[PDB]
Structures are given as C-alpha cells and as structure tokens.
C-alpha cells in the first residue's frame with residue numbers, strides 16, 4: 001500500500017522528502033519519491049549502526065560504557081570529558097565514535113553493512129573526506145564513500161528493531177533507550193537520530209532525521225531528509241519538520 005503524500009506544508013519551504021513505513025500493514029507513505037530513493041551520505045545517522053557494531057564486537061557493553069577520553073581540547077564543552085555511550089550518542093561526539101569504529105577491523109564492518117543492506121556498503125574511503133581539513137574528525141560515513149537512501153534507512157531501521165538481524169536483543173534495547181526523544185506528547189513514543197553534512201560537489205546539505213514512532217500497537221519506521229541549498233538547514237531543523245509531520249499526520 002504505497003501512498004504518495006504531500007507533507008510540503010510541514011517543510012515550510014525547505015526542499016526535502018519523507019518516508020514512513022508500517023511493516024505490519026505494509027503502508028508506505030512517501031513524500032518526494034525521487035529524493036527518497038536517492039543515496040546520500042548518512043552523516044551522524046550512522047551512529048545508530050556504529051553503536052550496534054561496537055556492542056557486538058565488545059568495544060562497548062552498556063549505556064554507561066566509556067572510550068577513554070585523553071584530554072584533547074574541543075570547542076563543544078560536552079566532548080571534553082570521559083562521556084558515556086548514552087551521552088556521546090546524544091551529543092553526537094565525533095571523537096568517541098571515531099575511536100570506537102577504529103577498534104573494529106574493516107572486514108567485520110563490511111560484512112555487517114552487507115548483512116544490513118546498508119546502501120552502497122562502500123567503506124573504501126575509511127578515513128573519510130580528508131580534503132575538508134578536519135583530519136581525524138572524519139570517516140567513511142561523513143560525506144565520504146558510504147551512501148544510503150532514505151528508503152534504505154527505513155528498511156534498515158525496520159530490520160533492526162523488528163528483531164530480524166543477528167544483533168543481540170540486549171544491544172537493540174540499549175540503542176532504543178538512547179535514541180528515545182521527548183516530543184511533549186506521551187501518547188507516541190518517538191526514537192531517532194539527526195545527521196548533518198554538506199555535499200560539496202552538488203552544493204547541497206545532507207540533513208537527516210531517521211528513526212521510528214510507536215503509537216498504540218502500530219510502529220512506523222521513518223526517514224526525513226533535506227537536500228536544500230541553504231547551509232542553514234541542519235539535522236536539528238529537519239528533526240523539527242519530522243516532529244511536525246508526526247504530530248499532524250501520525251497522532
């Protein structure tokens with residue numbers, strides 16, 4: 001049941017698209033089909049998968065797990081501490097997740113992405129987009145070789161959270177816990193992660209909010225994506241749009 005829908009009023013003039021999928025009744029709701037099928041860098045939404053990779057390989061073990069902060073100075077106050085998994089996920093702490101993933105061999109990551117059908121599964125540029133000058137604050141998931149479409153994001157979220165992967169249930173529940181967000185509506189449970197990048201080649205943002213919604217027995221897996229040319233459009237802004245869509249059409 002694939003419905004093409006018009007969520008444009010919630011996008012308040014920003015270029016983008018949305019896809020919501022309920023796998024129980026296979027009701028696919030799509031705004032801007034062309035964009036929803038286009039692969040792009042996942043940016044910080046990759047933290048959903050890298051958290052699971054780290055748990056499966058034992059690099060981390062719980063919401064409390066630390067990565068051994070070494071005292072390096074960062075402009076974000078909250079990166080300058082021995083933060084837990086839960087805090088690094090919510091702060092999108094790049095050094096924590098870079099150190100995590102660099103403890104994992106490339107073959108293991110390749111095979112996990114292949115199993116998840118995670119877009120092009122292209123980790124060939126492991127170091128990331130070094131031409132931006134940011135050095136070790138870079139990786140294959142940040143405007144680099146790995147690309148995934150919004151529709152594929154939803155398919156991956158569904159496989160993970162419906163229990164259809166080999167990841168341990170314990171590890172899925174840790175991810176659920178740390179992705180939960182507060183939308184000031186107790187009648188829906190929303191979970192997700194933002195991502196922000198700028199596509200230098202095409203001069204457009206990659207601004208993401210990916211996650212799931214639970215509303216009384218029904219679950220929707222969703223991905224909201226902007227490709228606007230305005231650099232002010234970030235992941236957090238697209239999360240605002242996503243929340244407005246959820247409150248208008250999914251309450």
Ligand SMILES: *C(=O)N1C[C@H](NOS(=O)(=O)O)CC[C@H]1C(N)=O
Nearest residue numbers: 043044092142194195196235236
């Ligand atoms: C992930 O996309 N990133 C890490 C960090 N958080 O992004 S978020 O607020 O959209 O979740 C900063 C932006 C980006 C990056 N430049 O690495």
